[PDB]
């Protein structure tokens, strides 16, 4: 499923993301845009370390979810990576929350550091009524 | 099912968890948060002793439930582990109560010792009307 911008904004808001760990809804939106283009089925296999990023937030199988095929992996979200490839994003949202509860917060995502951090992101939520 | 925070709090209170063996509702909430993110379908395989943790409270197959795949296991809750992956959490609540009946109580969960014990956990029930 590819979310439309405002559709995603309302969904994330409904799922308790707006201000979670001091992270605005617009920031979560910017993260989803740059990671997956709002695509819940997105996957990115890294031949380098044989890990894969899953779903709308591109969560990595080396540390966060289990795909049963990543060397030296842990499963900190206690969840199958397939749960992060579903149209219903509740599991993905729960796991993203777990990620930012770690010390480095949303900076865990290099794409967010590069394309969102310190920048204007107001346009992600503009006109969504959230 | 992935519970919303306040929905889970009210559900646990309804199932008689608040004050069970001296354990506050907020402590059960913190446990669930750091085990599964309130996800009834969470699982975690432990290569160490070939056991798996099941469900919202991440209850282990070596001692507490039967998954038919864990060597030398016992089934103290008298439940198949599949019952602990269901939307209805009555069985999971009954099993968590049984776990904390043992001498170490809630300290059985290492995630709880690391993320909850001795810390302020009022945030977990704030605004829930419980």
Residue numbers in the entry:
A (entry chain A), B (entry chain B): 1 to 130
Kindly provide excerpts from the paper associated with this entry.
Among other functionally enhanced enzymes, the Arg101→Asp and Arg115→His double mutant was found to lyse bacteria effectively at alginate, mucin and DNA concentrations that inactivated wild type hLYS. Iterative model building and refinement to 2.04 Å resolution yielded a unit cell containing 2050 atoms in two protein chains and 237 water molecules, which was in excellent agreement with experimental diffraction data. The Arg101→Asp and Arg115→His mutations result in minimal perturbation of the global enzyme structure, as demonstrated by a superposition of the double mutant model onto the crystal structure of wild type hLYS. The mutated residues are situated at opposite ends of the substrate-binding groove, and as a result they have little impact on the catalytic core of the active site. The mutant Asp101 side chain forms an electrostatic N-O bridge with Arg21, and is within hydrogen bonding distance of Tyr20. Even more striking, repulsive charge-charge interactions cause the wild type Arg101 and neighboring Arg21 side chains to orient away from each other. At the second mutation site, the His115 side chain lies alongside Trp34 in a parallel displaced π-stacking interaction. The corresponding values of the double mutant are 8.9 and +4.9, respectively. Consistent with the net charge shift, the overall strength of the double mutant's potential field is substantially decreased relative to wild type hLYS. At the same time, the two mutations manifest an expanded negative potential field in and around the substrate binding cleft (compare Fig. 3c and 3d).
Human lysozyme (hLYS) kills bacteria by catalytic hydrolysis of cell wall peptidoglycan, but also exhibits catalysis-independent antimicrobial properties. Its dual functions result in a protein that attacks both Gram-positive and Gram-negative bacterial pathogens, and hLYS has been shown to be the most effective cationic anti-pseudomonal agent in human airway fluids. The cationic nature of hLYS is thought to play an important role in guiding the protein to the negatively charged surface of bacteria. The dense positive charge of hLYS, however, also represents an Achilles' heel, as the wild type enzyme can be sequestered and inactivated by alginate, a biofilm matrix component associated with mucoid P. aeruginosa lung infections.
